[PDB]
């Protein structure tokens, strides 16, 4: 066309190549959204740090960016829409205290049924497992006073209790997991799944747990893409 | 004392002097009709006068 | 050239050379491919989803099968009726060279495309941590170009296209000359490699899926309908592709290589060989008919959607 037009076209081509290279570089990582409460101990899990707080870690072959939102009111329905493409939502909930446990259940059911998060899977960390075991084994703060349905409920016969765990501890753990998974499955159409886990705040396997769960999520996404067509 | 601030704001808002709904509608209609001839979106301009042509 | 001696007998037209075979297979394949294309068009109208390279490959496959059937069956049925005649229509070696080119094109495209699709599925299953759709279309175009380039070889030498039994189709000759054996071996080798790669990749994918499923879920965390359906799809693909295409490739590779030459020096071909070739081409042709059924229609979601 002309000299100015040629220069503009060359600049545009260089810019497009730069954007393509940056996208190729940045598409190999995974993004996760961290959620919970004040007492959930969100920052404790994944003991690595290599408004918005971003954490980076690198399991055997992949790198994860965990994004946490701070200084936000209860009206999460607005900014949550931003994270409609994250690979997973790491929902950390304190499993020791029972007074606020129902509030956590309500928060989880609100997150699960969100309009913009109908495809994002949830990795649930039932934190403070040691505190829960100590409280239940101490013969105090009965769960029945906060959960009438807990009574007359027994652990499934075809179950795998942790080695050395007392029957009461495993019973309480399974009750909590069952409540969360029931809320997960009642409204679930199979598009997204909830993965529960029991952390201890002194465990180094949380990163590997996230890695395995994200791998499974991606595999299921690929299988759905193949089959539905 | 947020109640006092709310009361003051309400009084200030009510201090306005509305003229007429019909007058506002007529003014809007007149403004729309005045510029009706300068609306390329409303009236498709000639292809020779359209910068996005190819 | 391009025409070889042959003459049908009385009983042959009634049982083996009857025209109902071509019409039946062509109509069934066309209807199945039309239904598959309708389903794919509906899915596309739903929206091009992420990692849609598989959708691109599937669309290319169904389109190739549909075009191949619609092109070849028309000529075959017309010749069966009495509209075309190799001794009267295009007597100057004009018409069925195109028929051989298109036949090779549409016989090679499905195999290579299936191999590519199997490779994509293997990558997406065994190694999840790996990734536009332009690349898929580029690959489809490259596959079609390779198939056509192989098909055009006899035009510039080596190969030879001739009208074969029952005098209704025109295909590569099973001669003992250097060019004939070279082209036959090349075609059979590429077909066998495509089938083998598809089978191997699908087997590895099915093994990985079985390891994932049989692997204890601990808490029954997942209903594995999706993994079971994929395993069934892959097993069907493997069995159908192999059992349908391998015999023809083996036959065309074996016929060219024989101590007593198959085709006599005068150009005559034994009736047994002609009948075997016709039967093997029919069983191979059924691959295209069953392809959309295995890939698309034999799906729980698609069957449920088409139920009402």
């Amino acid at each position: 066309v002309s000299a100015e037009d040629k220069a503009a076209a060359e600049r545009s081509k260089m810019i497009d190549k730069n954007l393509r290279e940056d996208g190729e570089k940045a598409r190999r990582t995974l993004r996760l959204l961290l959620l919970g409460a004040d007492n959930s101990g969100k920052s404790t899990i994944v003991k690595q740090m290599r408004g918005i707080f971003e954490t980076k870690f690198q399991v055997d072959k992949v790198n994860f960016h965990m994004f946490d939102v701070g200084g936000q009111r209860d009206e999460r329905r607005k900014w949550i829409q931003c994270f409609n493409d994250v690979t997973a939502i790491i929902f950390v909930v304190d499993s020791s205290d029972y007074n606020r446990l129902q509030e956590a259940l309500n928060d989880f059911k609100s997150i699960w049924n969100n309009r913009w998060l109908r495809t994002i899977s949830v990795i649930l960390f039932l934190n403070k497992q040691d505190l829960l075991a100590e409280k239940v084994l101490a013969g105090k703060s009965k769960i029945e006073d906060y959960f009438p349905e807990f009574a007359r409920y027994t652990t499934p016969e075809d179950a795998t209790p942790e080695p050395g765990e007392d029957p009461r501890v495993t019973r309480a753990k399974y009750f909590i997991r069952k409540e969360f998974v029931d809320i997960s499955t009642a409204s679930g159409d199979g598009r997204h799944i909830c993965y529960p886990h029991f952390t201890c705040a002194v465990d180094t396997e949380n990163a590997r747990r996230i890695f395995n769960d994200c791998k499974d999520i991606i595999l299921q996404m690929n299988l759905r893409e193949y089959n539905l067509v | 004392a947020q109640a006092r601030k709310l009361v003051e704001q309400l009084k200030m808002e009510a201090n306005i002097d509305r003229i007429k709904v019909s007058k506002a509608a007529a003014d809007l209609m007149a403004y729309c009709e005045a510029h009706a001839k300068e609306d390329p979106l409303l009236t498709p301009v000639p292809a020779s006068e359209n910068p996005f042509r190819e | 050239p391009c025409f070889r001696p042959t003459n049908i007998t009385l009983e042959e037209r009634r049982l083996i050379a009857s025209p109902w075979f071509a019409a039946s297979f062509c109509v069934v394949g066309l209807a199945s491919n039309l239904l598959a294309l309708s389903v794919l068009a509906g899915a596309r109208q739903g929206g091009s989803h992420t990692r849609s390279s598989f959708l691109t490959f599937l669309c290319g496959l169904v389109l190739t099968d549909f075009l191949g059937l619609l092109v070849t069956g028309t000529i075959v049925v017309s010749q069966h009726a009495a509209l075309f005649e190799w001794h009267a229509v295009d007597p100057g070696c004009r018409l069925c060279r195109f028929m051989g080119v298109v036949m090779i094109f549409f016989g090679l495209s499905p195999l290579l495309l299936g191999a590519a699709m199997a490779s994509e599925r293997y990558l997406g299953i065994t190694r999840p941590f790996s990734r536009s759709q332009r690349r898929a279309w580029a690959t489809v175009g490259l596959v079609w170009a390779a198939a056509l380039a192989l098909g055009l070889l006899p035009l510039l030498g080596v190969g030879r296209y001739t009208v074969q039994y029952p005098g209704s189709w025109c295909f590569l000759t099973l001669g003992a000359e250097s060019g004939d054996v070279a082209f036959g071996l090349l075609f059979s080798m590429l077909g066998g490699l495509s089938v083998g790669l598809s089978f191997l990749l699908n087997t590895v994918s099915v093994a990985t899926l079985c390891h994932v499923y049989h692997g204890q879920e601990a808490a029954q965390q997942r209903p594995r309908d999706s993994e079971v359906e994929m395993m069934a799809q892959l097993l069907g693909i493997m069995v159908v592709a192999s059992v349908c295409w391998l015999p023809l490739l083996v036959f065309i590779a074996q016929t060219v290589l024989r101590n007593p030459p198959a085709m006599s020096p005068a150009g005559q071909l034994s009736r047994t060989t002609e009948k075997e070739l016709l039967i093997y081409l029919r069983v191979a042709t059924w691959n295209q008919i069953l392809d959309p059924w295995v890939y698309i229609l034999f799906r729980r979601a698609v069957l449920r959607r088409l139920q009402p």
């Binding site: 600049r11 954007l19 | 808002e13 009510a14 003229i19 979106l41 | -």
Partner: protein, 338 residues
């Protein structure tokens, strides 16, 4: 104390409602029924600006009338020339989460904001080339939803903490603050005189704030959900508000009434953005249904429908010259309709 204040507020609200009802001597529909409706409007894509690798969240035209800045989740502010399809600048972002972008009238400055809560102002006219952080505005307690350039030295920005702030670029300090919203301020529109601006929030209401005085001159309500976006009529006495109720309510300033409401049974999702034509006759509104609707501002009828994009249509805008309309969706593709 509290009871007396509540009674006074109730009395003031009742008096305001009575005055509003009295001023409602007629309806715009009755006046406009005598106007011949505009025929069907059919607009086809002319430019398909592509290159963004993530979901586009904002857009804003420029005074040059062929210029628009787009921001996405990949963390890039891309300045496009509408006439051609050649990118002019591709500024990178410190934070990949950006929700608001704004183009200064002079074209020498641009503004960006998002979940980081810190607004970044970049100077396009670099003395030695390259674009970097020309200024950083901080002090808000929430994510920034919208921002506009009153001039080359003053910038108004609305945050999710239920507040708006006028900042001086040269001083980099909060020269003024506006408060009173009960919900997050998700919208903001500047009047032609750049003196009074109407802002909406999650409180399902809008408020008119005067820049010089910084007082809530008027407050309008009626929406049943949050107001996602707001546009100001060119004349200077009316505006339009789009909410999640699948309704678009056009109000008035002098009348102090909800002049009209646009809704249809077929449309059920919320409206992401609103815009006005050069004369204001046509109202543009993008919907979550992946479409855009052109309504007749004086007939309450869906004049036209623009179909495009494979994902949510988020940002909308109309060039000052009024020759084209830009729309950006989560498909990662802007588009220009004419």
């Amino acid at each position: 104390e509290l009871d007396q204040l509540r009674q006074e507020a109730e009395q003031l609200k009742n008096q305001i409602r009575d005055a509003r009802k009295a001023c409602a001597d007629a309806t715009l529909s009755q006046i406009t029924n005598n106007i011949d409706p505009v025929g069907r409007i059919q607009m086809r894509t002319r430019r398909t600006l592509r290159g963004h690798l993530a979901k586009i969240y904002a857009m804003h035209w420029g005074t040059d009338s062929r210029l628009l800045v787009s921001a996405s989740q990949d963390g890039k502010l891309i300045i496009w020339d509408s006439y051609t399809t050649n990118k002019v600048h591709a500024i990178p972002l410190r934070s990949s989460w950006v929700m608001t972008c704004a183009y200064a009238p002079s074209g020498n400055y641009v503004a960006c904001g998002g979940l980081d809560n810190i607004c970044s102002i970049y100077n396009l006219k670099t003395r030695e080339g390259n674009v970097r952080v020309s200024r950083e505005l901080a002090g808000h307690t929430g994510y920034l939803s919208c921002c506009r350039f009153l001039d080359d030295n003053q910038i108004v920005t609305s945050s999710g903490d239920t507040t708006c702030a006028l900042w001086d670029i040269e001083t980099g300090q909060q020269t003024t603050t506006f408060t009173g919203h009960t919900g997050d301020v998700m919208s903001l529109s500047l009047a032609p005189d750049t003196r009074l601006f109407v802002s909406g929030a999650c409180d399902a209401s809008a408020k008119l704030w005067d820049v010089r005085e910084g007082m809530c001159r008027q407050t309008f309500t009626g929406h049943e959900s949050d107001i996602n976006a707001i546009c100001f009529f060119p004349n200077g006495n009316a505006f339009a508000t789009g909410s999640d109720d699948a309704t678009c309510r056009l109000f008035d300033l002098r009348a102090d009434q909800e002049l009209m409401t646009y809704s249809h049974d077929n449309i059920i999702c919320g409206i992401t953005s609103v815009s006005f034509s050069k004369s204001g006759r046509l109202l543009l509104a993008g919907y979550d249904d992946f479409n855009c609707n052109v309504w007749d501002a004086l007939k309450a009828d869906r004049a036209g429908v623009l179909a495009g994009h494979d994902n949510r249509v988020s940002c909308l805008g109309v060039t000052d010259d009024g020759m084209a309309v830009a729309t950006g969706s989560w498909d990662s593709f802007l588009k220009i309709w004419n």
